C-alpha cells in the first residue's frame, strides 16, 4: 500500500501519494524491469516537468535489474532531448540498462550511493527459425551492440575498444570504480 | 501506479493523471501489444480531440511490437478520416503495425527518435480445417496483404513492386534509414 | 495381450501368435488411426506376401477412423504396384483414408459387411506463419484434394464432378449404398 | 482491509490510512520480504520526513525475514546519508537483512522487543552457465560477504573475525543476546 | 464486500467502514491465519489507540486457526509494553498462537464465548539442509518451546512442567475447562 | 457490481450500497459458505446495530449451504448475547449451518419462504496421523456433534434422542415440513 | 506388434521379424523423425549389409517429415562411403532430410512412386544468448545451408543459384516434378 | 526395434542383435547425450574385447551431443588404462565430451566423415546456496577446465594457451578444420 | 539395450548380457543413485560370488553422485562381513556414499582412476512436524554423522578431528590427492 | 536390469536369475514398501519352500521403510502358521513394519547387521467423513495399536507398558541397543 501525504499550500491543505509528492520536486522513480509501459509512464514525467520548468534539473533514481533495450532507449533519447539536465543516481544497483541510463546522464550530474553495484553486459536476444530469418535478427542485434558500445564511449569517455573487451562478458563495478571507469562522477556519502 | 499531477487554472488547482493531462495537450500514447480494446481507446481519443478543435494537430506517441491488422486498421481509418493531422513520433520501436501507423501520419510531421528502430514485414496468420476453408482464409489474408502494401507505398512514397521485396522478410530499419525510405520525415536529436 | 495359436505341419507343432498366422494367409489388418509407423508395417506385409507368391489374392481388412494422407498414399501405390489383387474388406467403419483405400482394392474383389458404414470428405489441413507460406501450403493440399478425388473417380467409376459434390463435407454411406455409389461390389452376408 | 482513522487538527477534521498516520509521526514500517519495490517505498518516506523536519528522529519498525542485498543496501545508504538518526525497533523477527538494517540503526537509538529473535547469515545466491561466467558471479557474491561482515563489525562493533566465524552459519540471537553482541542497545519491555 | 456505516458526530455526519467504526470504539479484530501483515496492522492499531486515550482499555477479539510464532510475539510483546490494558475475547475458536494471545489478555478481562472452542499444542517447524544446520534451528524450535510454555505458564497460573505435559499434544479446552485451567478468566453468556 | 441507491431524505442525500442501506434498516444478509471472514463481518454488524437501539429487532437473511463449525458458533453466540431479538428468515435454502442459525432465531420470529429447503446433518470432519492424535481429534467432534444437537433441541423443542437419529444422515425439510419439527415458527406468502 | 514370418532356409524353418526378414533381402526402412539413434542404427545395418556382400546393391525405402541434420549426414556419408550402391526409394513423403537422402542415392538407382511428394526447405534452427554467440551459431547454421545446397547441386544436377532460389521457402514436388527436378530418375507404377 | 541378424559359422548360424553382432567386430557405438549409464555400458565393452583380444584395434562411432564430464573421464581413462589402441570416428557431430574422447583415441588412428561437424567448448555448471559453497564448486568446476584443456592440448598438439582461447566459446569445425587442429587424423572419404 | 556376449566354454557356447557376463568374473557394477532396490541387487551378488569361491578378490566399479545411507550402509557391512577381499574402483566420480564405500575396500586394494573425483560431505536430511519429533530425527542424523565420520577415520587412517573438519562442507578430492588423504592407495593409470 | 547367473547341477548348466538363484537357498528380500502386492509374493515364496522342505531354516532378509499394516500382518501370520523357524535379518533399515516383521522372526534366530537401524512407532491413519464413521475408523486403528503392542511384547520380552511408552512417537534404535531391547538376538560383525 502505497501511503498519503499531506502539504501545506497557500490554497489550503492538500493531499498526495508518495510517489506524486517526490514528483513535484522533479523525481522520477526507476524501479524494477524495464519494459514497454513503465518506460513510457517514465518518458512522460520528463515531458511534464520539462514544460513546468525548463530550467531546473530533473532527477532520476534507478534501482533496477535490466530490461529491454527498445524501452530503454525511449528513455535515453527523451533525457538527450528536453533541455533539463537529468541527474542520475544509483540506489541499490543498476544493471545493463539501468547502467546505460545512469552513465547516460548529464555530465557532473552523476551520481552514486556507496553501497551500490553497478553491472554492464552485452546485449542478449534469441531467434528460433528459418536461416534467412537467423542472418537478419543476428545482423540486427549486433548493430544495437555497436550502438550501444559507441554511447557508453561516449558518456564514460572510455575507448570504444576498452568497452567492448570488457562489456564482452559481464563485469560488476562498484561505487569507486565506476567513478573510475567513468559511468558516474561522484558518490554520495552524507549529507552536506 | 500512475503518477498524480497538478494543473493551475482560473477556477484553482485541478489534479489530472499524468497521462489524462497530456491527453489535454492533444498526445496520445500507443503503447503494446495492437488489441482491440486499445484500438478503440485510441480512437476515442481522437474523436473527442476533434471536437474539442479540429484545427490543432494531434501528437500520436507510438512504442508498440506491433499485433491485430483489424484492430490497427480502425485507427488508420479514424486518423484518415479526421480533419485534424495526426503527427506520428516513434519511441524504441515501431514494428509492423507500428510502423503502418507511424508512416500513415501526416505529410512533414511524422518524426523519429535517434536510437528507434523501426521495422516492417509481411502479414502472418493461420488457419485450420478443410481444404474449402482454407483456400478462402489464404485469399483473404492475400488481400489483406496487398492492400497494406499499396497503402505503404502510397504514404513512404517508393514504389508498390519495391515495397513487395522488401517487406517479403523482416527488415530493420533505423531512424535515419526509414528517413530515406520514406517511413518518417525528420530526427528530433535535440530541443531547439 | 495378444493369444498363441499352435499350428500343425508335417514337420511338427508350430507356435504362432493371432495375427501371425492369419498373415500365413495372405490376411494383413489395418486397424486404428493411419499413421507412417503403421502404414509402413503393412507395406512390408504386402511385399513379404508378394514374393512368397505373386499370383494368389491377398486379404485387407479395413478398421479405421482415418488418418494422414502421405501414409495412405504408400500402401495405395504398393497395393497397386504388386501384382497379386488386394481384396478390401470393411469392417465396422472405413473413413477418409479407410475408404480411398477400400475402393482401391482390385476391381470386382472389394467387400463391406452388412451393418458396417463409409465416410468420406476432403482433406484436413492446417498452416500458421507468414502469407507467402500460407499460399504454398494451401496450393499443396488443393493438389491433394483433386489427385484423390480423380482416383476416386477412377475406382467407383462416378464423375469427378459428383465426387467434388459429394466429398465438400462429409458423407455417410452405408453397406447398400456403397455398392450404388461404386465403392464396393458386394455385401458378405453369410458364408456360401 | 486497512482502516481509516480521524485526525483531528486545527483546519479541521482528515481521514487517514493507519499506515499514513503514523508516517505523519516519522514511523515507516518494513515488513515482510525485502525487493526493489518495498524499499524504494522505504526510501521515498525517509526522504520526506527529512524535508519536513530533518532533526527530529525518524523510526523504522523492523519485522522481516530478509530479502535481496541490493534493495537493503538503498534503505542502508538512505539511513546513513539523511541527517536525521534513524530508530530501528525489532518486533517479532529480524532476518540477515532485517538485523543489518537493525544494528544499522543510530548509536543508542537502537532497540528490540524482548520475544523478538534475530538471525545473521552470509549472503545466498547462484549462477548456472560457463566456467568462466562462473568465476565472475562468485567473486561477487565473495565481496558482498566481505563488504557486509565489515559492516556489521563496524556498528555491532565485534571484530571483523568473529562476525566471519558466527556468520559462516545460520546464527539466532534472543534479544539479550543481541544486546551482548552489540545489534541492538537495549530492550523496550514496558512503558516507563 | 465490506459496508459503510453512518456516525451522527457533532461536525456532521461521516461515513466509516464497519471495521473502522469499531477501531473508534477501542476494537480491534484478529481473525484469520496470523502473518506478519495482518500482524503489523493489529501492532498500529494498538499503538493508535494508546495515545488516543491510555486509560482506557483496548479490546481485542480473537477467532483465528494459529499461524506464525514470531507474527505473534509482535502482537504480544506490543500488548505488554502499551500502558492500556488489553481485554481479549475469544469468539469461535482460539488455536496455539490464538489462545496465547487469549490468555496474554489483562488479568480478569479474558473472556470467553460458552460456545467457543479452544487448541494449545507446542511449536511446529522443519528444516532441510545438512546434519549442522539442522541441529541449529532444532535448538531454536525447542527453545521457543521453552519460552511459550513458560509465558503460558504465567498467565493461566499452572506450573511449567504441567503446561509441557498438556502441550505436548494437542489438548482441546471449552469454554469452562479453560476457565479452570486459566486462559480466560469469565464467560460472557448474555448482556446484564 | 453492486447497484448505489440514494435516500432522498431531510439532512441532505446519502448515497449507499445497496447491502449498507439495508443494514442501515436493520437487515443483515448471510449468503455463502460461512467462514471466518464473513462470520466476523456478521458479528461487527449485530454489535454495531446493538448501539442504536437495543430494543428494535434485527433481521438475518439466510441463504447458505452451510459452512465451518467454529464460525458458526461465533454468530450463535453474539445473537443470544446481544439484547434485540434476531429474527431469521430462510431464503433458498438452509443447510447444517445455515438451519442451526435459522432455529437459533428468537422464538416467535423465525420465518421460511414457502418453497425454501432446510436440511440438517451431523458435523464432518478428518484427520490425518497417528492413531493417539486421531482420538483427541474424533472426541473433539463428537462433542461438537453433542453439543450441536443439544441447542437444536432446545430451539426446536424436540428431544435430544429425535434429533439425533434425525441427524445421523442428511435429511431435507421443506417450509411446512419444518414449522411442524420447530425450525422455524411460520411462512411468510404474501405481504398482508 | 510387428508379425512373425517364417524362412525356410538349409538348417529348416526359421523365424524372424518382418523387419528382419527384409533386411536379409538388403532392404532399410527409414521412417519417422530423423534423429541419432534412429540413424545410429541404419548405419549399422549397412555396414553389416557391406560386410555380406560387397558388390550387391541395397534399397532404402524413405517416408518421413525430415529430421535433424547431423543425424542425417552419418546416413549420407555411409551411402557415399561404402562400395554397394544404394538405391533410395520414395513412399508416401520425402522432407528436407528425406529428400537429401533420396537425392544421394547411386545415379540411376532413385525411384519414386506415383503419389509420392517431395518437400525441400532450408535449415532451421535457433538459439538463445548473446550477441556474441548469437554470431558464432549463426555463421554455423549459414556454412550447413551453403554445404547442403551444394550437394543437393551435385545429386540433382541443377545449378547452385537454382537450387538458392527453391530453398528459400518450402517448394513441394509431386513424382513427375521430382524427375524434371533431378531429384530421381524413374517412377515405379507398376510391377509388370 | 533393433534388428536381428543372422551369424553363419563352422557350429551353425546363430542369431545376434545388430549392435551385438558388431561388437564382436569391435565395434562400439557411443550414441546419445553422455550420462553415467552409458557410458558404463560402454566402459563393460571395452573390458570385454581387451580380455578376448588384448592386441586387435578397437573402433568407437561418436555421434553425441555432449553430456555430463565425470561419465566421460571414465571412458577416457578407460581407453588410456587398457593396451588396444581404440581408433575414433565421429559421424553427425562431436561436441565438448564427444570431440574429447574423439582426440583422445589413438595417434594416427583418429577419423572423421566428410559432412561432420566437431564443437568444443569450456564446461557448464552452476550451484545455489551460501557464499562459502559456492567458492568450492567454482574451484572445482574451474580445475575441471584447466585439466581438460591440458589434456586436449597433448591430443591435439597445440599450446594450452590457444586451447584456452579457442574453447572459452563454442568454436565449430568441419572435417578438414579438425585435422589441421590436430583433432583427427584423417577424412574417410571413400572405402578405397 | 545392453549387448550379448557369447562365452566359449568346453560344453558349448553361452549367450550372456554384457553385465551378467563380467559378473562371473567377480566385477560388480555400481552405477547411479544409491536407493534400497540397486544396493540390495549388489548385496545378492556379493553372497553370490562368496559362495562360489569365498577367497577370490572382488571388484567393485563405483561411478555414482551418492544417495541414501541406509542402502549404503547394507553393502559395507556385507563387503566387511564376507571373507572375500572387495578391490573397490572409482571411475569418473565419487559422491559421499560413492566415496565411503570406495575407501571402505580391502586395505591395499582400492584404486582410482587418474582423472576421476572423490567428494565427501556431511550427511543431508529434515524433517516437518512437531518440535519434540524434530529433536528425535535430529539427534538421529547427528549420530549418523558421528558414526559415518567414526568409519572414514579407521579406513583412511587420518584423525576424527580431521574428518569432522573436512566433512563440514562439501570437500572435492583428485585422485591425487585421495591416494594422500587415505581413502584410495594407488591409481592405476595403464594396464602394464 | 538384474543379472543372470548359472548354476552347475547334475543334469546340466541351468540358468537363473540373481533373485531366483538366492530363492533356493530359502533366502527372500523384503525391499521398498511393504504393500499388498509385494506381501503377496512373499508368502508364495514362504509357501513354496515350506513344501519343497518343511524343516530346513528360511532366512528373510528386510531392508524396508515401512508401509501398510494389512499386508505385513500377512507375512507375519504366514511366518507363525509354517513350521519352518524364519530366520530374520535386517540390512539398511527397518521401519515399524520392518521391525515388527524382524522381531517376528525365530526366538534365536534373529541377527542384525552392525550399522544397521531400527525404528518403531505407532499406526497412522486418518479417514475423512461424518463424525459417526470417524468413531468406527477411530476405534478401529487404536485396536491395530493395542494388538501390534501385544505381539511386540511378546517377541521383544518387553512388559507391555513399557512398548506403549516407546511407540508414542519414533524410537531410533542401533545394532547393539537392539540387542538390549530383545528386538533382535546376535550382530553378524564377520562370518568367522
Known amino acids: 500500500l502505497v501511503p498519503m501525504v ?5 490554497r489550503g491543505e492538500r493531499s498526495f501519494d508518495i510517489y506524486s509528492r517526490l514528483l513535484k520536486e522533479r523525481v522520477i522513480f526507476l524501479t524494477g524491469q524495464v519494459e514497454d509501459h513503465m518506460a513510457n509512464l517514465i518518458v512522460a514525467q ?5 514544460a513546468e520548468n525548463p530550467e531546473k534539473d530533473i532527477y532520476l533514481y534507478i534501482n533496477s535489474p535490466g530490461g529491454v533495450i527498445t524501452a530503454g532507449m525511449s528513455i535515453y533519447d527523451t533525457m538527450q532531448f ?3 539536465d ?5 540506489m541499490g544497483q543498476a544493471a545493463s540498462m539501468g547502467a546505460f541510463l545512469l552513465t547516460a546522464g548529464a555530465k557532473g550530474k552523476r551520481f552514486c550511493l556507496p553501497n551500490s553495484r553497478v ?12 536461416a534467412t530469418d537467423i542472418e537478419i535478427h543476428a545482423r540486427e542485434i549486433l548493430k544495437v551492440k555497436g550502438r550501444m558500445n559507441e554511447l557508453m564511449a561516449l558518456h564514460t569517455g572510455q575507448s ?10 559481464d563485469r560488476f563495478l562498484s561505487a569507486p570504480e565506476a567513478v573510475e571507469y567513468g559511468l558516474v562522477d561522484s558518490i554520495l556519502t552524507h549529507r552536506n
Not at 86 to 90: E, L, M, W
Not at 120 to 126: K, R, S
Not at 160 to 169: F, S, Y
Open 46 to 50: 520528463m515531458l511534464f516537468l520539462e
Open 119 to 130: 553491472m554492464i553486459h552485452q546485449p542478449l536476444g534469441g531467434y528460433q527459425g528459418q
Open 86 to 90: 537529468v541527474s542520475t543516481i544509483c
Open 160 to 169: 570504444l575498444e576498452q568497452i567492448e573487451r570488457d562489456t564482452e562478458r
Open 6 to 10: 499531506i502539504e501545506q499550500t497557500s
Open 82 to 84: 528536453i533541455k533539463p
